[PDB]
Amino acid sequence: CLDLWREKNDRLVRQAKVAQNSGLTLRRQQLAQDALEGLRGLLHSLQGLPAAVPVLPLELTVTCNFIILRASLAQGFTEDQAQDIQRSLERVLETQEQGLRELWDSVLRASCLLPELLSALHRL
């Protein structure tokens, strides 16, 4: 289950990097927006589950990757990404509302509880 999601993630990263190091303007974007839709699907797939403790490091990782790739293709940022962050932190809290400031405050208190996903969280 989780192994399948992980392995899809990895497949998609590799696809991304293959297009990145090689490829021309069209084939690059083709493989990219492929991987991108895969990651959308995988995000949604993971957002279908109640967020057990053992899943989160993958959830955060994927959303991070999604954000990065989205933004790099768009060549700019948006607010949908900030919304995705709010959603991921909402998830972290449901494990254990107001605004980005208080969310972050409560998240970082919930992380100095030491569930070990800080190598993703700090990236987020």
């Binding site: 289950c1 399948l4 699907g41 949604h44 797939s45 279908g48 109640p50 053992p54």
Partner: protein, 162 residues
């Protein structure tokens, strides 16, 4: 109660929900249900014989994590490579998802446009096309593709659909 029986039988097994039911090859009458963590084989979700026979499968239905969210089930195909069984089954969920399963392996999830679906059916409609038509409690309905779990038509109104 059957006509073939005429008798009010009680179900011996203590189920919570009975998301699907119907006949299967070699098994006869059947209920999908449950009794009361990412391992496919664990599943938490009892198949049932109907008229008090063995559970008959607890092997390759949905993982127990999903078992909290899913609100409807509709079986698409059942093979026997042995005493066990292999089902391709569609579920759909509180979070407005339609999910496929194969030996309990979640593949091909789709995210529905509208909210709180109630039922889902399958449309043949021509050469190699196939639609899952989903209804909701909001008196609306979508039709999602097969082979690429996505949306193809979206509608609201509709006291009934056939």
């Amino acid at each position: 109660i059957s006509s073939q029986t005429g008798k009010v039988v009680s179900v011996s097994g203590n189920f919570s929900s009975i998301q699907w039911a119907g006949e299967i090859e070699n098994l006869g009458m059947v209920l999908l249900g449950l009794k009361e963590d990412y391992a496919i084989w664990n599943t938490k979700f009892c198949v049932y014989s109907l008229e008090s026979q063995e559970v008959l499968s607890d092997i390759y239905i949905i993982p127990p994590a999903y078992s909290s969210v899913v609100t409807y089930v509709h079986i698409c195909a059942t093979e026997i490579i042995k005493n066990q069984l292999r089902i391709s089954l569609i579920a759909l969920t509180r979070k407005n998802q339609l999910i496929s399963f194969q030996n309990g392996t979640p593949k091909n999830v789709c995210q529905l446009p509208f909210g709180d679906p109630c039922a889902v059916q399958l449309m043949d409609s021509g050469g190699g096309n196939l639609f899952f038509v989903v209804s909701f409690i909001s008196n609306n309905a979508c039709a999602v593709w097969k082979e690429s779990f996505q949306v193809a038509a979206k509608w609201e109104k509709l006291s009934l659909v056939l």
